[PDB]
Structures are given as C-alpha cells and as structure tokens.
Design an enzyme around this catalytic site. Structure first.
Site, PDB file in Angstrom:
ATOM      1  N   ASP A   1     -49.439  30.275 -14.735  1.00  0.00           N
ATOM      2  CA  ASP A   1     -49.944  31.334 -15.598  1.00  0.00           C
ATOM      3  C   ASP A   1     -51.458  31.416 -15.443  1.00  0.00           C
ATOM      4  O   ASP A   1     -51.956  32.264 -14.715  1.00  0.00           O
ATOM      5  CB  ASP A   1     -49.513  31.100 -17.055  1.00  0.00           C
ATOM      6  CG  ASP A   1     -50.041  32.151 -18.014  1.00  0.00           C
ATOM      7  OD1 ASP A   1     -50.443  33.252 -17.574  1.00  0.00           O
ATOM      8  OD2 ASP A   1     -50.022  31.884 -19.231  1.00  0.00           O
TER       9      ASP A   1
ATOM     10  N   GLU B   1     -43.148  23.478  -9.047  1.00  0.00           N
ATOM     11  CA  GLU B   1     -43.473  23.873 -10.420  1.00  0.00           C
ATOM     12  C   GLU B   1     -42.584  25.015 -10.910  1.00  0.00           C
ATOM     13  O   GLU B   1     -42.033  25.770 -10.110  1.00  0.00           O
ATOM     14  CB  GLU B   1     -44.959  24.269 -10.496  1.00  0.00           C
ATOM     15  CG  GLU B   1     -45.489  24.722 -11.865  1.00  0.00           C
ATOM     16  CD  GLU B   1     -45.518  23.610 -12.904  1.00  0.00           C
ATOM     17  OE1 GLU B   1     -44.451  23.031 -13.191  1.00  0.00           O
ATOM     18  OE2 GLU B   1     -46.607  23.324 -13.445  1.00  0.00           O
ATOM     19  N   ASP B   2     -42.448  25.155 -12.228  1.00  0.00           N
ATOM     20  CA  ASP B   2     -41.668  26.252 -12.775  1.00  0.00           C
ATOM     21  C   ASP B   2     -42.480  27.556 -12.867  1.00  0.00           C
ATOM     22  O   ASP B   2     -42.013  28.631 -12.460  1.00  0.00           O
ATOM     23  CB  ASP B   2     -41.072  25.888 -14.151  1.00  0.00           C
ATOM     24  CG  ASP B   2     -42.116  25.393 -15.155  1.00  0.00           C
ATOM     25  OD1 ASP B   2     -43.255  25.048 -14.770  1.00  0.00           O
ATOM     26  OD2 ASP B   2     -41.781  25.349 -16.360  1.00  0.00           O
TER      27      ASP B   2
ATOM     28  N   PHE C   1     -43.194  36.426 -22.148  1.00  0.00           N
ATOM     29  CA  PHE C   1     -42.719  35.042 -22.260  1.00  0.00           C
ATOM     30  C   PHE C   1     -41.262  34.936 -21.832  1.00  0.00           C
ATOM     31  O   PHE C   1     -40.400  35.650 -22.361  1.00  0.00           O
ATOM     32  CB  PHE C   1     -42.884  34.518 -23.687  1.00  0.00           C
ATOM     33  CG  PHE C   1     -42.820  33.024 -23.779  1.00  0.00           C
ATOM     34  CD1 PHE C   1     -41.608  32.381 -23.985  1.00  0.00           C
ATOM     35  CD2 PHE C   1     -43.972  32.262 -23.640  1.00  0.00           C
ATOM     36  CE1 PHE C   1     -41.543  30.991 -24.056  1.00  0.00           C
ATOM     37  CE2 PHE C   1     -43.922  30.874 -23.706  1.00  0.00           C
ATOM     38  CZ  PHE C   1     -42.704  30.238 -23.919  1.00  0.00           C
TER      39      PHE C   1
ATOM     40  N   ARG D   1     -33.707  25.347 -22.230  1.00  0.00           N
ATOM     41  CA  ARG D   1     -33.660  24.720 -20.905  1.00  0.00           C
ATOM     42  C   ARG D   1     -32.241  24.726 -20.336  1.00  0.00           C
ATOM     43  O   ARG D   1     -32.045  24.826 -19.115  1.00  0.00           O
ATOM     44  CB  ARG D   1     -34.224  23.298 -20.937  1.00  0.00           C
ATOM     45  CG  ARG D   1     -35.699  23.204 -21.367  1.00  0.00           C
ATOM     46  CD  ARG D   1     -36.315  21.863 -20.927  1.00  0.00           C
ATOM     47  NE  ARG D   1     -37.572  21.529 -21.600  1.00  0.00           N
ATOM     48  CZ  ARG D   1     -38.790  21.882 -21.181  1.00  0.00           C
ATOM     49  NH1 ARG D   1     -38.941  22.612 -20.079  1.00  0.00           N
ATOM     50  NH2 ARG D   1     -39.858  21.508 -21.885  1.00  0.00           N
TER      51      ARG D   1
HETATM   52  O1  LIG Z   1     -43.368  32.705 -19.972  1.00  0.00           O
HETATM   53  C1  LIG Z   1     -43.511  31.395 -20.136  1.00  0.00           C
HETATM   54  N1  LIG Z   1     -42.444  30.588 -20.431  1.00  0.00           N
HETATM   55  C2  LIG Z   1     -42.543  29.238 -20.608  1.00  0.00           C
HETATM   56  N2  LIG Z   1     -43.739  28.620 -20.501  1.00  0.00           N
HETATM   57  C3  LIG Z   1     -44.895  29.394 -20.191  1.00  0.00           C
HETATM   58  C4  LIG Z   1     -44.814  30.759 -20.008  1.00  0.00           C
HETATM   59  N3  LIG Z   1     -46.105  31.237 -19.722  1.00  0.00           N
HETATM   60  C5  LIG Z   1     -46.944  30.181 -19.730  1.00  0.00           C
HETATM   61  N4  LIG Z   1     -46.243  29.060 -20.023  1.00  0.00           N
HETATM   62  C6  LIG Z   1     -46.790  27.650 -20.113  1.00  0.00           C
HETATM   63  C7  LIG Z   1     -46.581  26.920 -18.843  1.00  0.00           C
HETATM   64  N5  LIG Z   1     -47.511  25.807 -18.533  1.00  0.00           N
HETATM   65  C8  LIG Z   1     -47.451  24.801 -19.611  1.00  0.00           C
HETATM   66  C9  LIG Z   1     -47.589  23.350 -19.170  1.00  0.00           C
HETATM   67  O2  LIG Z   1     -47.021  22.404 -19.969  1.00  0.00           O
HETATM   68  C10 LIG Z   1     -45.674  22.447 -20.235  1.00  0.00           C
HETATM   69  C11 LIG Z   1     -44.761  21.770 -19.214  1.00  0.00           C
HETATM   70  P1  LIG Z   1     -42.978  21.375 -19.661  1.00  0.00           P
HETATM   71  O3  LIG Z   1     -42.838  19.911 -19.995  1.00  0.00           O
HETATM   72  O4  LIG Z   1     -42.112  21.702 -18.428  1.00  0.00           O
HETATM   73  O5  LIG Z   1     -42.498  22.272 -20.901  1.00  0.00           O
HETATM   74  C12 LIG Z   1     -48.869  26.332 -18.348  1.00  0.00           C
HETATM   75  C13 LIG Z   1     -49.219  26.687 -16.927  1.00  0.00           C
HETATM   76  P2  LIG Z   1     -50.878  27.271 -16.605  1.00  0.00           P
HETATM   77  O6  LIG Z   1     -51.857  26.021 -16.567  1.00  0.00           O
HETATM   78  O7  LIG Z   1     -50.922  27.916 -15.287  1.00  0.00           O
HETATM   79  O8  LIG Z   1     -51.341  28.249 -17.690  1.00  0.00           O
HETATM   80 MG   LIG Z   2     -44.818  23.427 -15.453  1.00  0.00          MG
HETATM   81 MG   LIG Z   3     -42.977  24.063 -22.439  1.00  0.00          MG
END
Ligand SMILES: O=c1[nH]cnc2c1ncn2CCN(CCO/C=C/P(=O)(O)O)CCP(=O)(O)O
Ligand SMILES: [Mg+2]
Ligand SMILES: [Mg+2]
Ligand SMILES: O=c1[nH]cnc2c1ncn2CCN(CCO/C=C/P(=O)(O)O)CCP(=O)(O)O
Ligand SMILES: O=c1[nH]cnc2c1ncn2CCN(CCO/C=C/P(=O)(O)O)CCP(=O)(O)O
Ligand SMILES: O=c1[nH]cnc2c1ncn2CCN(CCO/C=C/P(=O)(O)O)CCP(=O)(O)O
Ligand SMILES: [Mg+2]
Ligand SMILES: [Mg+2]
Ligand SMILES: [Mg+2]
Ligand SMILES: [Mg+2]
Ligand SMILES: [Mg+2]
Ligand SMILES: [Mg+2]
Lengths: 203, 207, 198, 197
Positions: free
Chosen positions: D118, D114-115, D167, D180
C-alpha cells in the site's frame, strides 16, 4: 483413528514412476507417501475436525516450518466444507516456531478459544508435550492436535494426537515441507532420503 | 515400464480412512487406488506422453465411457505442460465407443482426421487386450503418423492375448474394480477412487 | 438466475498476464473467462444442482464434444459434495453428440441433467430436450456453461456465464476443432480465424 | 522495470454478486462483493510463477513468506514453482518465514512473498533488513498493489493485481484477524466493517 497405517515392510514407490525434481534425483531412495494420497487423507481429516470442533470458533495454530504445507492444505479442505454447508464457524490463524515459543500472537489470543494445533510429525512426543503445556498456560477452552505423521518408536512418551494422517515406521522422511537440514521442503511427496542424500546435505 | 505394480495380496485401504460417497458406503469393500495416487501417476504419464509424442500434432482419442476421467485428467496435465514450456504443439480431441455384439467403433469424427497425426488412445483398462487390438487395427488403416495407447489400468490375467499398452498407470491383479469412471452395470462411475466392490454391492447392482 | 453476467463491453484480459500455450500466442485476442473463474462458478453450480436435483438418482448427460470439460468438472464438484456433505446423488452418466451418436437409449423415471457448453440459437438444446422427453424422465434440467445474449426463437436451469455475442474458444469450445486444448475461455483473433479456417 | 506488472483492476470495478459463488455462511452478511475470485488469483499466480522462474531460476531460491497475510499466496506460488521444477532442469529451493508488526538467505536468490503493498513502508523496512544478510539477489512478489497517491514510490518486481484504494479481505488478508479463512478476495460490507473494527 491411529490413521493410515504404513507398515514396516512398505516398499513405497520407485522414484521413476512419479514426477520428481531433477535436483533431488540421487538424494531420495523411494516415494513413501505420494502427494495425492496425503491430499485424500487430509480431505477426510478436515471432515473429522469439523465433526469434532465445528460447534465453535477455532484458532488454527501452525507449527512452523515443517507444518506449513499440511496446515495450508488442511485449512483449504475445512474452508471447502465451510462454503458448501449450511453451518460454518469462523477460523482465525496463527503461526509459531519452537526452540521456547517464538513469534506468534500474544498467546492470550488463545484464551477461551478452541485451539487446533497443526504439526508435521510426532516422534518422541516431547515437542507436543511441551507445546501443549505452554498453550494451556493461556487457558484455552479446548485444545486438539492434528499431525500429518506419527512415528512408531520406542522413544514415544505416550502422547497421541487427536487427528493423525499416517502412522509410519521410524524411518527418516522428507518432503511435503518436512526437511533434512532445510532441504527437501520443496518436494510435493513424502520420501525416504538416501544415504547419499544424507551426506550431501549434512551440516 | 509396467507402471505402478499392485501385488496380488495388496489389502487396499479401509474406507473409514477416506471420504466416500454415502450412497456407496456398504457397496464397497476397500479403497484400492486412492484418487490422489492416480493423479500423481497421471502427472508422470503426461510427461512421458509429451516426451514421445510432443513433436507433432496430437489427436487424443477418448474411449468412452470408462475412459472419460482418465482422459480429462491426463489431458489437463498435458495442457499444463504445454502452457508452461517454451514450445508446444496443438492437440485436438475425439471420442469413440466400442460396441459389443464382435466389436465395432461407434461415433467419433470421420477417422480420416487421424491421417498424419500422433494419435493417443486413452483407455480405462486393458484386460484380455481384444478391445484395443480391434481399435488399433481400425486406426492404422487411416495412416496416423504414430499411434500409442495409454491405459490407466492393465490387468494381470492368463486370458491376455499379449497386448501391452505404451503408457500404463497401474498394473493390477485379476480383481474386479470400479470407480474413477470404471463401472459395474453403469454404477460406481461417480466415485473418485478405484475400489473393490462388496458382496452387498455386486448383488445390489447386478443386472 | 441468469448466471454471471459478462457485459457487452467487457474487455477481457491481456494474454501476457496468464499462462497460454505458445502455439496459440498469435491466435487469441484476449482471455475472456479465466479457467479458475470457471471453476469458482462451477463450484457454486454444483451446489445449486444438488439443492434442486438431489436426492433422486441423476443421469448426467454430456453433450459432446464441447461440453466434456464443463461436464467433468461439474461432476467432480458434485462428487465432492456427495462425499463431504449431508446429501447424496448417485449419478450415472452418458454422452451424446449431435452430428445422434452414442446415447444408451435409460432415462425413464430418472432425474436427467443435460450438460452443455454453450447456448446460442438454442437449437442443440431444443433437440436434446425433445430427446430425453421422449423417454419420460421424472424431470429434466439443463446446465450450460455459457449462454449468449442473442435472439432465440426453454431457459436453462443452471447457467455459468451470460456472455455477449462474441465468438469464444477454449475450455473445450472449438473453432474448427482447434482451441479445445486451452483451459481459459478466450476471444479468437483475426489471424486465428484465418489460420484455422476450414 | 517491473518484471511482472499485474492485472489492472479499475476504480469502477463492480466485482461479483456473492450469490454467484460459494461463500462461507458465517461471512454471508459481512461481505459486499467478490472482488477477485480465488480461481482468478490461481491463474494469475500460475503465470507469476513462470515469470519468477525465468528471472530467478538460475540459482538456489530462498522464498521468504511475510506472515500472516502472505501465507496463502506463498503456499500457492511455491506450489506452482514446484510444478515447474519437476516437469522440466531444476533449482533447489528453501523456505523461511518472517513477521512484521536468516543466514538461510546469504548468497542466494531471495524471493520475498507479500500479500499487499500500500504505502510501501513495510516492504522498504523489510528490504533494509534482508539486504544485511547479503543475498545474491532480492526480488519481491506481492499479490496486490494498491493505487494510492500515498505510495512512497516503492514497486515490487512481481505483481498479481493492481487494485484501487479500497479495503479488501480474503485469501489470508484480514480485517482485525477475520476473513483470512476465505478463498476469494472481497470487499467488506458496512456491517462487517463495523462488526470487526
Ligand atoms: O485493503 C487492505 N486489506 C488488508 N490490509 C491492508 C489493506 N490496505 C493496506 N493494508 C495493510 C497492509 N500492511 C499492514 C502490515 O501489517 C500487517 C500484516 P498481517 O500479520 O499479515 O495482518 C501495510 C502495507 P504498507 O507498508 O505498504 O502500507
Ligand atoms: Mg503483509
Ligand atoms: Mg492485518
Ligand atoms: O522422519 C523425520 N523427518 C523430519 N523430521 C523428523 C523426522 N523424525 C523426527 N523428526 C524431527 C521432528 N521434530 C523436530 C522439531 O523441530 C522442528 C522444526 P522445523 O524444521 O522448522 O519444522 C521433533 C518431534 P518430537 O519432539 O516428537 O520427537
Ligand atoms: O475390473 C474391471 N472393472 C471394470 N470393467 C472391467 C474390469 N475388468 C474388465 N473390464 C471390462 C473392460 N473392457 C470392457 C469394454 O467395454 C467398455 C466399458 P464402458 O467404459 O463402461 O463403456 C474390456 C477390455 P478387454 O478387451 O481388454 O478385455
Ligand atoms: O462463440 C462460440 N464458440 C464456439 N462455438 C459456438 C460459439 N457460438 C455458437 N457456437 C456453436 C455452438 N454449438 C454447441 C453445441 O454443440 C457443440 C458442437 P462441438 O463441441 O464442436 O462438437 C451449438 C450451439 P446452439 O445449438 O445453441 O446454436
Ligand atoms: Mg514439527
Ligand atoms: Mg526439521
Ligand atoms: Mg474401456
Ligand atoms: Mg463397463
Ligand atoms: Mg454444445
Ligand atoms: Mg464446434
């Protein structure tokens, strides 16, 4: 270009001259395209892509799964260009699998955009024929295809990609994310699979 | 292992298929050994080196100037092995140059630093083998624990005195090659691939 | 530009978060400048060098032994620009060591880039600069991976990182010939100082 | 215990001036600072790969990439794992991809890549599905983990960096699909935030 032409009588390389994971030691006949050679060719393709598509936003479309390594690397070389040149244009990315198109954003995200489709291999050309027809239903501005490999085969429908890494004989190759029944994706080089390997991993 | 054997009739690759420095564009004829292939072979050589020499402190000796790229890369692959394995050995480095007048060693540390160590000499190319036989004769006098030679390239030539290195990247025809730190009159070192130089090029850079 | 400023109070990183040769496990205190960060900064330095020195022909002068890694990597990034961008070198290379071994005697009317691992007292640099200048180059520039904040009786043209007055090793920088075989720049520990003391 | 806890990035981490790095021109105004340099990500990921192999290398590993943001960390982490596998004693590895907005897993050591974590909601959701394919073992590697009181309490097994509640974008992490195509992890400027919301 038709790309780097690998001729039918290419010996490739003995496995023992390279670093190869031990779990595939019996399953490969030869190294066919060394990883580093792929990198060098891909560096040049990134430049060709930018020369041709650099004047607009690009959506780079990865054809999973076999496309993933080429895609990541090709994009890394484009990014290197973008951060060391005066001009650069942004890129967004997306991912799809073929079965019908599965996953991926609403293809309306392609509408009016410059689309770069990134594939691991063209063989008969039917898959790319089909994908191109699908994508075009969403009215992109431009579509180009990059394929790491193109096979010389009598089965070819006559489709040819815009960017081609290597033109190869019709041998079954694996590695650099290309698979045989999901195996061999975790191999850095492109290699010809042996008969022993074909039998161990057949489903 | 004679290394990756490149045949007499190998055509190399069209320059247009690769990224080439603009200033060498019409000075080269073909790419002969792509940089990436050199890297892949060097990765295997690092593993072979550690298998034979990894049991005791290694002193890696770079033969300047042409040896420098192969040296940096081979050592980086060896370092990668050493920081990802359970046990590792220290490695120190030195640099020497051999000067032709008759052939002598210029620079380097006092060679008493070699005493009792596993010495790895890293060279760009073996041709006649005279340079290395000369260097080996000097090094042995300092009683290293062992001394081995890795050479990126070994030329097939009738002028060979019969010296073969312990580790070999590629065995090549009797053609003049440049790139990856190998030069023609100090030029072409700033090129990542090993290439054959054109007629325009030999003339242009000729002494 | 003073380069990336690493503050006097910079704690560096725990060794256990990185890959480090086991033979130096007890000899280092912290990772100070991760290898990859050196690469990222070096990539930008290559572009700065080409903005300033290309294109006339460049002779790149490697100050051995410590400068060898920075030299090879900086030159690799410059070569990448030469084959992918809108400008060119050519470069020739030479290697000097101060102990002046090597050198070719070549620099006249050329753009010379002196490539150094670290500037502390500035004495190696003054020496290299009076050398070179005796051969009447067209221009001389100095690139140094590291510059210490320490009293110095010429400011380098290209600087990787400006660091505190701490003893660092790694990325070809040594302590009594040891630690050159380490990819990160790290701070040596007391036990490391004692073990490899000459 | 976290098998591989991460590089702790403090709340007052100032990051690096963009002018000290190679940055794509089209993002020059949209970013404020480099937060985690690409090369630092690589070095941490190298150690992470070894930790993964120490924990999971005894049996066939299936690496599951969480698209889209996970794709870079995934490609790189797998490249480091592969290096370990060929310079050693090796273990076969297969790959799969999943997106949130698979019999390939059964009886195998599943590594979810995972990236960012949060709140932890996404990962808990994903874990609840993956377990239904009855893997031998499931581990999660996340490049980033945010320090937030908002955390439901989920902790991945392998962590690259633990970051403050800011962020971040880059290294495949996006802000509304932008950023990206950037190698460094960065904090987004006020102008880039408003420009891409
Ligand atoms: O600092 C940040 N940068 C970019 N994205 C961020 C950040 N913080 C939360 N997010 C949202 C990340 N994810 C969003 C999931 O959906 C987006 C996946 P993708 O298709 O890779 O853009 C929430 C994780 P959790 O369930 O632990 O709250
Ligand atoms: Mg993710
Ligand atoms: Mg996203
Ligand atoms: O040598 C080979 N190695 C590996 N795969 C090969 C090879 N030749 C054809 N293929 C099948 C490639 N594709 C297979 C399509 O499905 C791929 C799904 P994935 O394994 O997830 O990338 C067909 C190309 P075309 O429509 O032009 O005939
Ligand atoms: O194809 C070639 N390209 C470049 N250089 C070549 C080539 N063949 C021989 N040489 C000369 C290599 N060496 C020359 C020695 O001088 C050192 C060259 P440099 O690294 O520029 O300081 C002879 C080896 P041996 O005693 O085995 O005959
Ligand atoms: O923190 C340190 N780590 C390692 N070496 C250090 C350090 N500080 C000064 N030095 C000595 C640096 N040397 C560096 C120059 O040449 C390097 C010699 P070597 O790499 O051992 O063959 C002199 C600096 P300056 O003339 O400006 O005073
Ligand atoms: Mg495909
Ligand atoms: Mg397939
Ligand atoms: Mg030589
Ligand atoms: Mg020469
Ligand atoms: Mg120095
Ligand atoms: Mg020293």
């Amino acid at each position: 270009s038709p790309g780097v032409v690998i001729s039918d009588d290419e010996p490739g390389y003995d496995l023992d001259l390279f670093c190869i994971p031990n779990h595939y030691a019996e399953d490969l006949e030869r190294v066919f395209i060394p990883h580093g050679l792929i990198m060098d060719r891909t560096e040049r393709l990134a430049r060709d892509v930018m020369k041709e598509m650099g004047g607009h936003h690009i959506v780079a479309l990865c054809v999973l799964k076999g496309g993933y390594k080429f895609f990541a690397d090709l994009l890394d070389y484009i990014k290197a260009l973008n951060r060391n040149s005066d001009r650069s244009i942004p890129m967004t990315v997306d991912f799809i699998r073929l079965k019908k198109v599965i996953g991926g954003d609403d293809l309306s995200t392609l509408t009016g955009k410059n689309v770069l489709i990134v594939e691991d291999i063209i063989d008969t050309g039917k898959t790319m024929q089909t994908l191109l027809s699908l994508v075009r239903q969403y009215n992109p501005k431009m579509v180009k295809v990059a394929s790491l490999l193109v096979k010389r085969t009598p089965r070819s429908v006559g489709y040819k990609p815009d960017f081609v890494g290597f033109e190869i004989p019709d041998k079954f190759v694996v590695g650099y994310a290309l698979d045989y029944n999901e195996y061999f994706r975790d191999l850095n080089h492109v290699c010809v699979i042996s008969e022993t390997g074909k039998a161990k991993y057949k489903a």
